[PDB]
Amino acid sequence: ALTNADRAEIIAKFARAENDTGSPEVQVALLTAQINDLQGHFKAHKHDHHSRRGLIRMVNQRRKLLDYLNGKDHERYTALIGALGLRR
RNA sequence: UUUAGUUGCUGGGUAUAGACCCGAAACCAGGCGAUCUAUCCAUGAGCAGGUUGAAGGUUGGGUAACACUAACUGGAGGACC
């Protein structure tokens, strides 16, 4: 799992302003870090469906935020997906 | 109570022997054969030419990851002509 320091580094890197924790960039980066972290758990616990539901919820939330950001500003969307490595 | 036998030689018959001659399928004992053939052991040799295209591998697409998937390779088989 990730710690407060790890989350703070991501927030500081992707923040668009001072004390900015609500921007789509920050939210999507946090969700991406959490999703990449959980892949290790689901490798050793393949039959844990109850947690996989929460993982799917994280994926859906990331998709919705990405679509909203693409609608608001295309340049920011491309920059964020490039910085995070997401294919879409 | 019956009062001529016996020993030779020749001949007829019988018995024991192959016993008038020829003829089995068999049974038993001791030896000879695996240069043919059956199986096995050791050491060598042989199988023109042409098809089909298993496993495996690489790359790409796809997925939140897995799945799934296309092409290229690869050369299996009591496989095919």
What is the Cβ-side half-sphere exposure of residue A1, based on CA atoms within 13 angstroms? 2
Nucleic strand B near CB of residue A52 (< 7 Å): yes
Backbone angles phi, psi at A35, to 5 degrees: -65, -45
The closest nt to A35, taking CA to C1', is B64
3-state secondary structure chain A: CCCHHHHHHHHHHHCCCCCCCCCHHHHHHHHHHHHHHHHHHHHHCCCCHHHHHHHHHHHHHHHHHHHHHHHHCHHHHHHHHHHHCCCC
Nucleic strand B near CB of residue A4 (< 7 Å): no
Tokens at A37, concatenated: 């972290």
Nucleic strand B near CB of residue A58 (< 7 Å): no
First to last CA, chain A: 25
Nucleic strand B near CB of residue A12 (< 7 Å): no
CA A68 / C1′ B38 distance in Å: 90
